[PDB]
């Protein structure tokens, strides 16, 4: 399963 | 050493079996921002207070993430000079991933400097036409598994906390940014306060709390705390090992029913290790891990290898949900910090109980 990075709220 | 005003009202915390690694990451052409040991130490120790006070408030005791303490009011921060100039580790296109692969090599050669599997990596801002001490940026700033990334700039100093100034406004944005990026490093997804917690406590940190931290009320949700309770650097049980293997949970007999304003969630579970807790997430589409700042969360204690769970959720707590499609996810949290999810999609215009 791929794990994307979690970026902050625009 | 002088104690800044924000750190004068602080609680004692239980000692933890493992500690968050702090790295100040320097490009080969980069100098540190002056006075960073003091400035980041105060900021990290206040943040540790925030997590511990929220954990205590939710019934888990005075537990926060561990820190390796060098001397009074100072964190034992690893200063790392990189093989390449800072241009080689930018925010975009794998800058973080490259910075992490180099630290993995550092920690394999210097195992005494590694105190847990969680690392917070801090880089000085770039200084060019886009960014500088006045508008920091250019460097990784996000969660990446159990690594997270934040930044430093000259006015990154807790003495500006809450102040109605440019430095105060700048500090809340990049301090809350660091707080939330660290949250992601501590096993936390994005989430949104319920309607009633929004009234009592303000803004969930893992939602839009990166814009409010230190200026208006900011807090951690019961679901966030249930995950922190199963986080390595919050552990006070040294016999419990973390993150080894794969999450093995069989979930059976699920039922999600809509009787009135209540959503009823129930089912069975079985796993070779203890299942500590169940988080439930409810959001509008789209569903990707960076489209979920609207996921309203709920949490329930479990505590067995095998058993049954049942929850009631008030539809009126679903603050900010406005779409006819909605998804309900069930996250099962294991004693060793792994977790797994099951998802279920519904339509208000064609609302059907789930029953398998
Ligand atoms: C999320 O909010 C953050 C502040 O809490 C911050 O603004 C972040 O923006 C990113 O910051 C990086 C810092 O090195 C880079 O400048 C990046 O270009 C920038 O987008 C916000 N994230 C997003 C995706 O906007
Ligand atoms: Ca969503």
Numbering used by the authors:
A (entry chain C): 1 to 10
B (entry chain A): 26 to 381
Authors' account:
Here we focus on OgpA from A. muciniphila, a recently discovered O-glycopeptidase that exclusively hydrolyzes the peptide bond N-terminal to serine or threonine residues substituted with an O-glycan. OgpAWT comprises two domains from the N- to the C-terminus: (i) a catalytic domain (residues 25–262) followed by (ii) a β-sandwich domain (residues 263-385). Interestingly, a Zn2+ atom coordinates with the side chains of three histidine residues, H205, H209, and H215, a highly conserved triad among metalloproteases. A glutamate residue, E206, is well-positioned to act as a general base/acid during catalysis.
